[PDB]
């Protein structure tokens, strides 16, 4: 996260860290959507152009963490993965269309002051909140500049109009993505960056004061460049797949 | 259950920047 700030304790209790098991290396962000289901980006798991095809035993998650500097007794929890489900129409060949994956935890995680699931959007919430100029929030332990922080970073960023997203880049965008960030004209800055993929773009509902995950950090071109914007997988658009996987397993 | 944080919404406390988000709805 570029131009963010340190998260407050418990500010993002749905935050999940995706690690390589051996050697332990932080790979990506992720988000907690129930006691045993975690959402991330597909490319953190599967990316043939880089010979990447991680299986369940290659990985682990940590949940309820605030700092990488110290072990947080009785607060942070580790879980192994039972199964990985990648979207079956994830397009790694072209533009990362449907960059989304679900991971089922071997052991359900106990909820706590630091561990708690985010909501997935219903239709009305999606239509109401996912509009240009509305701000969401992005969190991650990924790069601070186009190295990595000791405390979780957070940045608030406005959704951008689809024509502007589309004209900002030559990569073919789809309706399964959206973009966010400040325009040069607006003064403020900030972006997700390499290492933040899989982390959530969340929005707080004014109707019921619940936090909803609208996007998943997916891709960009540099970080925090003028006239460029981060791209997120559009969660709502893919929610029938999410529900089928969770309901059908 | 979902999307209500034990240390914030569940205790009627605001985080340091959430007002920026809610203001953006106006
Ligand atoms: Na930008």
Given 3.30.300.30, 2.40.10.10, 3.20.20.370, 3.40.50.150, which CATH number is that of A1-12+118-236? 2.40.10.10
Angstrom distances, CA of residue A175 to CA of A87, A88, A202, B2: 15, 17, 18, 26
Q: Per the residue annotation, which of A197, A218, A224, A234 is the catalytic one?
A: A197
Angstrom distances, CA of residue A5 to CA of A47, A137, A184, A188, B22: 30, 12, 20, 14, 19
Question: Hey, are the CB atoms on B20 and A156 less than 8 Å from each other?
Answer: yes
A212, A202 Cβ separation under 8 angstroms: yes
Q: Per the residue annotation, which of A66, A87, A97, A99 is the catalytic one?
A: A99
Cα separation, A53 vs A45, whole angstroms: 6
Q: Which residue's entry shows tokens 């972006």?
A: A191
Instruction: Give burial (CB, 10 Å; 0-12/13-18/19+) of A88.
Output: exposed
Angle, alpha carbons A34-A108-A118 (nearest 5°): 20
Q: Where are the domains of chain B?
A: 1-26
Angle, alpha carbons A193-A224-A44 (nearest 5°): 15
What count of residues does chain A have?
A: 249
Query: Which of A9, A135, A211 is the closest to B3 by Cβ?
Result: A211
DSSP string, chain A: -BS-EEPPTTS-TTEEEEEETTTTEEEEEEEESSSSEEEE-GGGTEEGGGTEE--GGGEEEEES--BSSS--TTT-EEEEEEEEEE-TT-BTTTT-BT--EEEEESSPPPP-SS--PPBPPPHHHHHHH--TT-EEEEEESS-S-----SB-EEEEEEB--HHHHHHT-SS---TTEEEE---GGG----B--TT-TT-EEEEE-TTT--EEEEEEEEE-SSSS-TT--EEEEETGGGHHHHHHHHHH-
Q: Helix, strand or coil for residue B23?
A: helix
> Which tokens sit at A54?
């991680």
A169, A140 Cβ separation under 8 angstroms: no
> Which tokens sit at A12?
């993002």
- DSSP tag of B10: G
Cα separation, A96 vs A30, whole angstroms: 17
Distance (angstroms) between ligand 1 centre and the Cα of A90 equals 26
- DSSP tag of B3: T
Is CATH 2.40.10.10 correct for A13-117+237-249?
A: yes
Nearest CA in chain B to A112: B6
Chain A residues whose CB is inside 8 A of the B17 CB are 137, 154, 156
* Residue A186: count of CB within 10 angstroms of its CB: 9
How was this model experimentally determined?
X-ray
A133, A159 Cβ separation under 8 angstroms: yes
A236, A126 Cβ separation under 8 angstroms: yes
Cross-strand bridge partners of residue A6: A153
Task: Decide if A128 is catalytic.
Answer: no
Q: Look up the CATH superfamily of B1-26.
A: Thrombin light chain domain (4.10.140.10)
What count of residues does chain B have?
A: 26
A44-50 contacts at long range (C-beta below 8 A, 24 or more positions apart): A44/A18, A44/A101, A44/A197, A44/A198, A45/A84, A45/A86, A45/A101, A46/A86, A46/A90, A46/A92, A46/A101, A47/A92, A48/A92, A49/A92
B1 vs A: CB within 8 A: yes
A234, A177 Cβ separation under 8 angstroms: yes
A91, A98 Cβ separation under 8 angstroms: yes
Residue ranges of chain A whose CB lies within 8 Å of a chain B CB: 8-11, 13, 33, 112-114, 116-120, 129, 133-137, 154, 156, 158, 203-206, 209-212
Span between the terminal Cα atoms of chain B, in Å? 27
Q: Helix, strand or coil for residue B20?
A: helix
Closest among A210, A203, A190, A24 to B20, alpha carbons compared: A203
Chain B nearest C-alpha distance from A43 (Å) = 26
Instruction: Give burial (CB, 10 Å; 0-12/13-18/19+) of A119.
Output: buried
Cα separation, A230 vs A193, whole angstroms: 8
Cross-strand bridge partners of residue A113: none
Distance (angstroms) between ligand 1 centre and the Cα of A228 equals 4
> Which tokens sit at A159?
């959704």
Q: Where are the domains of chain A?
A: 1-12+118-236, 13-117+237-249
């Amino acid at each position: 996260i570029v131009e963010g700030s340190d998260a407050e304790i418990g500010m993002s209790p749905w935050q999940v860290m995706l690690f390589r098991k051996s050697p332990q290396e932080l790979l990506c962000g992720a988000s907690l959507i129930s006691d045993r289901w975690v959402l991330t980006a597909a490319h953190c798991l599967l990316y043939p152009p880089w010979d990447k095809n991680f299986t369940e035993n290659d990985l682990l998650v940590r949940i309820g963490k605030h700092s990488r500097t110290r072990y947080e007794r009785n607060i942070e929890k580790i879980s192994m993965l039972e199964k990985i489900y990648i979207h079956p129409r994830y397009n790694w060949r072209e533009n990362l269309d449907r960059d989304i994956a679900l991971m089922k935890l071997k052991k359900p995680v106990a909820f706590s002051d630091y561990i708690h699931p985010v909501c997935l959007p219903d239709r009305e919430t999606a239509a109401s909140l996912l509009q240009a100029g509305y701000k969401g929030r992005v969190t991650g332990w990924g790069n601070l500049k186009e190295g990595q922080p000791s405390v979780l970073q957070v940045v608030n960023l406005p959704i951008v109009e689809r024509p502007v997203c589309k004209d900002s880049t030559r990569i073919r965008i789809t309706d399964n993505m959206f973009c966010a960030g400040y325009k040069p004209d607006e003064g403020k800055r900030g972006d997700a960056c390499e290492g933040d993929s899989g982390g959530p773009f969340v929005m707080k509902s004014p109707f019921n004061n619940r936090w909803y995950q609208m996007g998943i950090v997916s891709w960009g071109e540099g970080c925090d460049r003028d006239g460029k914007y981060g791209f997120y997988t559009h969660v709502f658009r893919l929610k029938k797949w999410i529900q089928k996987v969770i309901d059908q397993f | 259950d979902c999307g209500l944080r034990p240390l914030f919404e569940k205790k009627s406390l605001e985080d340091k920047t959430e007002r920026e988000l809610l203001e953006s709805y106006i």
